[PDB]
């Protein structure tokens, strides 16, 4: 997250860190046994870390659970990143408490202008790099579909939404992928891709979660 702030200790209890030796992607807890993330974050071996604040120090609220089932959307396209959504079923149920909570799926798609909360342990620099130990937060508005497409000509599908600032400076970045975009307590987006990080006229592009509610519920019910 570039241009954000350090989140209040465990003020994003639904945030998860996908680990395979080290943090490589984010995700979000939607129920005691399932995590939603980005399909491009796929790996054959994944340890899900819950209740994380400072990913480099054991604080005492963490729960480390191995992923049992890893299911990428059947229509995921690695070249366009269309349908960049993935579901993970934990090997054992997560214990829900004050530091580990689930986030609600959307009842309807978010309207342009809706302010949301984006979070992650990704790069905080637009040039070079700097990875934080503490979870970073960023408040940003959903952009009109028109704006989104004009920023990324011929690259925006109906399954993508832009969230951020055309002026640049504040944005998600490498390491934030799979992370949540929450608007009014509902998961509306998943960190997917973008042109560089925090560049003007190049806001972050996110998976439009409201288009996948049916698929998510059906996949969970079937597995």
């Amino acid at each position: 997250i570039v241009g954000g702030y350090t989140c209040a200790a465990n003020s994003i209890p639904y945030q998860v860190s996908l680990n395979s030796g080290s943090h490589f992607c984010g995700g979000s807890l939607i129920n005691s046994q399932w995590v939603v993330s980005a399909a491009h974050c796929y790996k054959s071996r994944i340890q899900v870390r819950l209740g994380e604040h400072n990913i480099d120090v054991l604080e005492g609220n963490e729960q480390f659970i191995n992923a049992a089932k890893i299911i990428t959307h059947p229509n995921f396209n690695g070249n366009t990143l269309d349908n960049d959504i993935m579901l993970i079923k934990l090997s054992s149920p997560a214990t829900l408490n004050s530091r580990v909570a689930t986030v609600s799926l959307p009842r309807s798609c978010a309207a342009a202008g809706t302010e949301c909360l984006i979070s992650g342990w990704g790069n905080t620099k637009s040039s070079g790099s700097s990875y934080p130990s503490l979870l970073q937060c960023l408040k940003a508005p959903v952009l009109s579909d028109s704006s989104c497409k004009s920023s990324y000509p011929g690259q925006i599908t109906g399954n993508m939404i832009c969230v951020g600032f055309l002026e640049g400076g504040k944005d998600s970045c490498q390491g934030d992928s799979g992370g949540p975009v929450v608007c009014n307590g509902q998961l509306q987006g998943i960190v997917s891709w973008g042109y560089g990080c925090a560049q003007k006229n190049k806001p972050g592009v996110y998976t439009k979660v409201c288009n996948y509610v049916n698929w998510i519920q059906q996949t969970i019910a079937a597995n």
Binding site: Q174, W193, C197
Partner: peptide
């Protein structure tokens, strides 16, 4: 990722 489109993983 600099001056190009890339996933943010």
């Amino acid at each position: 990722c600099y001056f190009q489109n890339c996933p943010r993983g």
